[PDB]
Amino acid sequence: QPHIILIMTDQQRGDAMGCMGNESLISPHLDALASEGTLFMNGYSSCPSSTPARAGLLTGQSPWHHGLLGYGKVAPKYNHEMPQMLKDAGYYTFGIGKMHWHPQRIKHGFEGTLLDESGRREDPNFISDYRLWFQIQAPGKNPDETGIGWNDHGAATYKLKESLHPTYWTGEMACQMIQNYDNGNQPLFLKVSFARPHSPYDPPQRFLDMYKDAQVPDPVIGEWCGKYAKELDPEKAAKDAPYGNFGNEYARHSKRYYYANITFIDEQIGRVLQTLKDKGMYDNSLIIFVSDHGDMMGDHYHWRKTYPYEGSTHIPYIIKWPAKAQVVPGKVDNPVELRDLLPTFFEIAGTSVPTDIDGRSLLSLAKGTETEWRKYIDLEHATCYSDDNYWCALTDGKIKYIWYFYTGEEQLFDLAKDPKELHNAVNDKKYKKLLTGMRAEMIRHLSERGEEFVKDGQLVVRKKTMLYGPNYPK
């Protein structure tokens, strides 16, 4: 069976790779990986915050089926779990970096994890393996010396050496494990999960310098986003503001520091891919690159995540297939989601997909032999940051329909003609047929949830937030 190398980052935008048509972003290692595999052009996170997206990843299930509908705790045990499935298939299973699991040191079938959980301390007496390692390298030093908060919109260069940075530690420990892999006939399942480019925007100077002459794209500003248009002083606003117009210059400054941290990650991913080649493991590895969700980075005067817009839900999505499986490198436009990785792994490991998994293997689609694929992927997020930010959406990456549970507002974006989502087309006479169709799809989607979500074939305005659905493990 092929090695499975699941590489991922936290809070990386789908548009933030060179191979996604971004001219100012330096990702030569990811661009090369994508050149040798399938670049999914419409990869989505269904629930754009760390823990529900990671539950979707872990279980191959929709938010309604794994039961976490927004920013909460991943359940300690699910019926189907990515690492346990592969262990049960005879894989040696290990995870390095961010799991964001509950408890933090739960394994879900991994033989071990080596954790960077950033500043989160949840288990009694918890210190991340990264932070214990840091004290060995630099005893009495402060891994947060740079002084930028975990949720900040501001930026600064890393105030420690590059070799103490969590991105270096993550790539370095993954490189050593691959370098030392000599486990007879047992295939490796390695998860490599970067905390970055989630805030802080704290790139080393060396990586910021790679952007000295770069012009990074402006934030995109829709006609509908008036509610957050007032120009504010970033030095006076909350350092972790989820909303704010700090001007285009401020947004481009933070975006440059964001892009520098992606280029740092991309260099570590380069080391991991070279180690695999050096060990002769690359060509019979399934290699995945994804993120759990995007970063709005000033788009529509939004910061952070948990919104339906492209900057929040559109994710990087690359598969380099085993050379044996005979996939021609290409692009797939169909809407794919984090839930589709576990069933792909089942097929590649040669285990039958259970019927209670929502994702669908991606191998046929990549081979252009798929006869049944979803029309639309469902997206949602439970109330986060503000009472109004509570929603469910459907998209194929050509149209997106958004239902705001708390306000009863609808939005409709023609992604084909309006990829930046500048124009809410919900009151456009030209879009009445498409809108009628998408409202019917949202009712079909939400009906299983019962009378608090759909009553007598109508969408229900909710006054209460459901964070944990009835399908959340008991």
Ligand SMILES: CC(=O)N[C@@H]1[C@@H](O)[C@H](O)[C@@H](COS(=O)(=O)O)O[C@H]1O
């Ligand atoms: C939805 C959202 O914005 N979630 C963020 C996470 O992305 C972040 O990882 C965490 C850090 O917590 S901390 O270690 O206490 O700073 O703070 C939460 O608010």
